[PDB]
C-alpha cells in the first residue's frame, strides 16, 4: 500500500480487483516547508550600562540595587562580553537566560576585592557574605565580576 | 518573513500552519490577530513590520483514484481534491 | 556532587586525532571556565589548555599550541579536546578541571578521574622534598613576575594514582 | 485636610445610552456579528455624573469613564496608599500622560494651580511611562479601566462632541489605548484638576460607570471597527 496510486486502491477496499469507479485513498496535505517565528522589533532594551558602564560604583556595605521591568535585557551580549571575567549564573544557566522571563531584575552593584569576589555565591561565608552582601542559598540570579 | 510557502507561523504568542499572503485587509491600528465567523485565525498582522498577512491553510484534502475495472486495465489517474496543481 | 566525568581515551597513532569528552554534572557547568591538563606517565602536571565560561576565550600551553582546539556544547553541558597532529610526548592521562574563578586567578578544584591517552616546566618548583613526622616542611615554588607575583598561587596535593586536590587557593586560603 | 472649598453636592445621576464599549481584544474582524462574554458597561445604565468634585470611588470590576480645557490630568488608583502601598497615578499636565505605581504621599488634597502638589514626591516606583498624551463642552474622552491577570489595560476614544450635561447620544467604540503590566491589585481611585487656598474651578464634567460581565453582540464592519452594539 505505498508504491502505485492503484495499490492504495486496492488497499483501502482491501481486494485485489478494484472495480471501475472513483476511489478516495487517503488524503494529502502540502507539509511545512519551514517555520516562521516573528516578534516586533526590539524597541524597550534595558540600559545596563547604567549599572555596569557607571563611573561610580558603590561601596559593598552600601551596594547600589537598580529596578530593571518595563524593559527587555539581552543577557547574552553580557555573557558574551569579555570585559566580564566572572559570570556565574546560580539557579539558572546563562544559555537559557534569553528563554526566560522575571518579573523584575535587581542589579546589585557593588565594588570588592579579588581575593574577595568567591564571597558573592550562594552559601558562602566571609566577611562580605555574612557581613556585606549575603545570597540565599535558593538564588536565581548571576554574579558579573 | 517568507510569503506563498506553507509555514509553520509564530507570530509572537499566535502559532498557527498556513501560507502567509500580502493582503488589502485594513487592520484598526491597533489590531495584530484576524479572524472570520468560524473564529479562526485568518489574518494577521506583522510585528516587526506593520503589514497585514492572510494565513491561508496550505493546500490540503483527499486523493480520489480514478480507475476503470483492474480487469480492464491497470492505468491510473488520481484526483487531488480542491487544490491547484502543485507537486504531480 | 560537583563529579566531572571523563571519556576518550585510548590507543592511538601519532599524526592521528583523539575526541576527548568530559561531562560535568551537579552545577551551572556554562558559567563556569575550565581546562583540559595533562600528566606525563611519572612526570608532573602540564596543563594543555583551557576554556571560558562562554566559550568565547581560549587559552593553550605553547607546547599544545596550535594543534588542539578546545571546545565546549553547554547544551548537552559537555567539554571537549580535540587532538591533531598528535605527537609521542602526548602519551600521557588526561584530567578536565573546574576554574573556580575567573582568570587570572585560576583555581582548579574538581578533576576528572582521569583518561589514558597513548600516543619543560615554567615554575621552577623543587623536583623534591623530604620531611618527617611531626616536622614544619616547606617547600617552595618559584617563578617570575608574571606567574608568582600577579597571580594567585594555587597548591595541588595529587596522591599516587589518583585525581589532583587543591589544597591552598589565592595564596592563602584551603577549601 | 482637603481643599477650603468642599461644597455639598449629591452624586447626580445620568444614563449612559450606548456608551462604554470597548474592543475586547486585538482581533481584526469584518462584516462580523461577534458575541463575546466580558466586562462591559451595561446599556442604558445610571452612571454617576461627578461635576470640582472627585470623591474616592471603587474600582470592584473596572470602571467606565467619560469626560467631558483639559482641566482633568489623570487618576489616583489606590487601597490603603498613605505611603503603605503601591498605587496608580496618571498625570497630564500638558500633552505629557505620566504612568507611575509609586509609593506616592500623595495627600487626600491634591492641590494643582501652572502648580502641582497633587502628591509631595513618590518613592519604591515599579513602573514609569512617558508615552505620548492620552488626553459648551467640546471634547468628550471616554477611558475604560480594567484589571485582568494583573494586567491593567486602559481602552480609551477621544471624540469632538457638542454638549453641555450627560452624555451624548450615538456610538463609538473605545479603542485599546496601552496595557500596563502592574501585576498589582487595585480597589479605589480619584481624579486630577489643575483647579493658594481660595482657587476657583473650571467647568468640567466627568461620569463614572461600572463594568460588569455582560454578554454583547458586536457589530464589526467591513473596515474592523465596532459600529454597533447590543447587550
Ligand atoms: C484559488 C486559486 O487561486 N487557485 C487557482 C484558481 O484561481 C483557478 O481558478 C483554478 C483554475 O480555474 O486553479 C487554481
Ligand atoms: C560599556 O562600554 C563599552 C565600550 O566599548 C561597550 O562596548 C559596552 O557595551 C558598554 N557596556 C554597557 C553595559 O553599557
Ligand atoms: C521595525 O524594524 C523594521 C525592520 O528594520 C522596520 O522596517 C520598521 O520600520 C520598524 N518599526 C518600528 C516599530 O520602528
Ligand atoms: C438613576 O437614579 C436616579 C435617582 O434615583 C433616578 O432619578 C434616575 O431616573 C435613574 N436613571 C437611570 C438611568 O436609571
Ligand atoms: C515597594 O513596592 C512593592 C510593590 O510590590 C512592595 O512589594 C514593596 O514592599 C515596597 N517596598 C520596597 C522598598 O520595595
Ligand atoms: C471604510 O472606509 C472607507 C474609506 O476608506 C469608507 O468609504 C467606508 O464607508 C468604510 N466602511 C464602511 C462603513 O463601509
Known amino acids: 500500500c505505498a508504491l502505485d496510486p492503484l495499490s492504495e486502491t486496492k488497499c483501502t477496499l482491501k481486494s485485489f480487483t478494484v472495480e471501475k469507479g472513483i476511489y478516495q485513498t487517503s488524503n494529502f496535505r502540502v507539509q511545512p516547508t519551514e517555520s516562521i517565528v516573528r516578534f516586533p522589533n526590539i524597541t524597550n532594551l534595558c540600559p545596563f550600562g547604567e549599572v555596569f558602564n557607571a563611573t561610580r560604583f558603590a561601596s559593598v556595605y552600601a551596594w547600589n540595587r537598580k529596578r530593571i521591568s518595563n524593559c527587555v535585557a539581552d543577557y547574552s551580549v553580557l555573557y558574551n562580553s569579555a570585559s566580564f571575567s566572572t559570570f556565574k549564573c546560580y539557579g539558572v544557566s546563562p544559555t537559557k537566560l534569553n528563554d526566560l522571563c522575571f518579573t523584575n531584575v535587581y542589579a546589585d552593584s557593588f565594588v570588592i576585592r579579588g581575593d574577595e569576589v568567591r564571597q558573592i555565591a550562594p552559601g558562602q561565608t566571609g566577611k562580605i557574605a555574612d557581613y556585606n552582601y549575603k545570597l540565599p542559598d535558593d538564588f536565581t540570579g548571576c554574579v558579573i565580576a | 518573513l517568507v510569503k506563498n510557502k506553507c509555514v509553520n507561523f509564530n507570530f509572537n504568542g499566535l502559532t498557527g500552519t498556513g501560507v502567509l499572503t500580502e493582503s488589502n485587509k485594513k487592520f484598526l491600528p491597533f489590531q495584530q490577530f484576524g479572524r472570520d465567523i468560524a473564529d479562526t485565525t485568518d489574518a494577521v498582522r506583522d510585528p516587526q513590520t506593520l503589514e497585514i498577512l492572510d494565513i491561508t491553510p496550505c493546500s490540503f484534502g483527499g486523493v480520489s483514484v480514478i480507475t476503470p475495472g483492474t480487469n480492464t486495465s491497470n492505468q491510473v489517474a488520481v484526483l487531488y481534491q480542491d487544490v491547484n496543481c502543485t507537486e504531480v | 556532587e560537583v563529579q566531572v566525568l571523563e571519556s576518550g581515551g585510548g590507543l592511538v597513532q601519532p599524526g592521528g586525532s583523539l575526541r576527548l569528552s568530559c561531562a560535568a554534572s551537579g552545577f551551572t557547568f556554562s558559567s563556569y571556565d575550565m581546562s583540559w591538563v595533562r600528566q606525563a606517565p611519572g612526570k608532573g602536571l602540564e596543563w594543555v589548555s583551557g576554556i571560558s565560561y562562554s566559550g568565547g576565550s581560549t587559552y593553550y600551553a605553547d607546547s599544545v599550541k596550535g594543534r588542539f582546539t578546545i571546545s565546549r556544547d553547554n547544551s548537552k553541558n559537555t567539554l571537549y579536546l580535540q587532538m591533531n597532529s598528535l605527537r609521542a610526548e602526548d602519551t600521557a592521562v588526561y584530567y578536565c578541571?573546574?576554574?573556580?574563578?575567573?582568570?587570572?586567578?585560576?583555581?582548579?578544584?574538581?578533576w576528572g578521574q582521569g583518561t589514558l591517552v597513548t600516543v619543560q616546566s615554567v615554575l621552577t618548583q623543587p623536583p623534591s622534598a623530604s620531611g618527617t613526622p611531626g616536622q614544619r616542611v616547606t617547600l617552595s615554588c618559584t617563578g617570575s613576575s608574571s606567574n608568582i607575583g600577579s597571580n594567585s598561587v594555587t597548591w595541588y596535593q595529587q596522591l599516587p594514582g589518583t585525581a589532583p586536590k587543591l589544597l591552598i587557593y589565592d595564596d592563602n586560603q584551603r577549601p | 485636610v482637603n481643599l477650603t472649598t468642599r461644597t455639598q453636592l449629591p452624586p447626580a445621576y445620568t444614563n449612559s445610552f450606548t456608551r462604554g464599549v470597548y474592543y475586547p481584544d486585538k482581533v481584526f474582524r469584518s462584516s462580523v456579528l461577534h458575541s463575546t462574554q466580558d466586562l462591559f458597561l451595561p446599556f442604558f445604565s445610571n452612571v454617576t455624573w461627578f461635576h470640582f468634585d472627585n470623591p474616592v470611588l471603587p474600582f470592584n470590576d473596572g470602571v467606565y469613564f467619560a469626560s467631558t480645557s483639559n482641566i482633568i490630568r489623570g487618576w489616583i488608583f489606590g487601597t490603603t496608599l498613605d505611603s503603605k502601598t503601591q498605587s496608580l497615578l496618571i498625570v497630564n499636565n500638558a500633552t505629557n500622560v505620566v504612568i507611575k505605581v509609586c509609593e506616592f504621599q500623595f495627600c487626600n488634597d491634591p492641590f494643582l494651580g501652572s502648580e502641582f502638589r497633587v502628591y509631595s514626591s513618590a518613592n519604591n516606583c515599579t513602573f514609569e511611562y512617558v508615552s505620548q498624551p492620552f488626553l459648551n463642552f467640546k471634547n468628550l474622552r471616554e477611558f475604560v479601566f480594567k484589571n485582568i491577570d494583573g494586567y491593567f489595560k486602559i481602552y480609551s476614544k477621544h471624540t469632538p462632541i457638542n454638549l453641555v450635561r450627560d452624555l451624548p447620544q450615538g456610538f463609538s467604540a473605545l479603542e485599546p489605548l496601552v496595557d500596563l503590566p502592574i501585576g498589582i491589585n487595585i480597589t479605589r481611585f480619584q481624579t486630577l484638576l489643575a483647579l493658594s487656598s481660595g482657587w476657583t474651578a473650571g467647568a468640567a464634567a466627568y461620569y463614572v460607570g461600572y463594568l460588569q460581565p455582560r454578554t454583547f453582540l458586536l457589530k464589526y464592519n467591513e473596515n474592523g471597527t465596532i459600529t454597533d452594539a447590543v447587550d
Open positions: 578541571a573546574r576554574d573556580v574563578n575567573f582568570v587570572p586567578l585560576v583555581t582548579f578544584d574538581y
